Amino acid sequence: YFKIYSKHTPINLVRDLPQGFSALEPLVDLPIGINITRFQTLLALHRS
Amino acid sequence: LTGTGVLTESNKKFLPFQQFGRDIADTTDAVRDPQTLEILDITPCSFGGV
Ligand SMILES: *[C@@H]1O[C@H](CO)[C@@H](O)[C@H](O)[C@H]1NC(C)=O
Ligand SMILES: *[C@@H]1O[C@H](CO)[C@@H](O)[C@H](O)[C@H]1NC(C)=O
């Protein structure tokens, strides 16, 4: 079971993480049944 | 999930993910019914000492 828990928070801090409490609600309970040992996030380029 | 009780209306604001509820004994105290998605509270039937 691949569990994705998510939370969106309106913040106004410039650089670091805000200090506070916010519980993450479960978003997607995903039935994959596969082995995961390594990950990589995806960014987006800007072209001009 | 099997059990005995009276099913009543409830005022517990369940979150979308949340389906059932559990008491201290871990016995189910509220349940979300399939097909109609409503939240039914489960209150044990009246009992006591004769
Ligand atoms: C997952 O993969 C790693 C290496 O790829 C392996 O050592 C590990 O035993 C695997 N786990 C399962 C549950 O297949
Ligand atoms: C059947 O159950 C689904 C939830 O699993 C619900 O969305 C749907 O409205 C139900 N349909 C009927 C006809 O009860």
Side-chain angles (χ1 to χ4, degrees):
Chain A
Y1 266 116
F2 180 96
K3 272 81 68 176
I4 308 185
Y5 308 87
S6 188
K7 182 63 184 294
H8 296 284
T9 298
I11 60 168
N12 50 342
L13 199 148
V14 184
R15 186 176 173 88
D16 211 0
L17 281 171
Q19 183 177 2
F21 203 94
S22 65
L24 267 70
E25 300 167 69
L27 182 62
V28 175
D29 195 2
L30 185 63
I32 50 157
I34 62 170
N35 192 3
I36 291 164
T37 53
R38 215 177 48 250
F39 65 98
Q40 174 269 358
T41 187
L42 308 164
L43 292 173
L45 305 183
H46 285 331
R47 305 269 191 175
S48 66
Chain B
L1 202 174
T2 306
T4 315
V6 307
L7 304 199
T8 59
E9 215 82 16
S10 81
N11 47 308
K12 311 222 178 308
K13 56 175 58 48
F14 278 24
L15 283 199
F17 70 89
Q18 268 155 2
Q19 302 294 301
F20 65 99
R22 268 184 173 179
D23 64 359
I24 318 292
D26 283 7
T27 76
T28 303
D29 60 32
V31 73
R32 180 182 297 263
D33 72 326
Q35 321 165 294
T36 308
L37 280 67
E38 175 62 341
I39 38 167
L40 307 178
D41 219 288
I42 305 174
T43 308
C45 303
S46 295
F47 74 108
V50 169

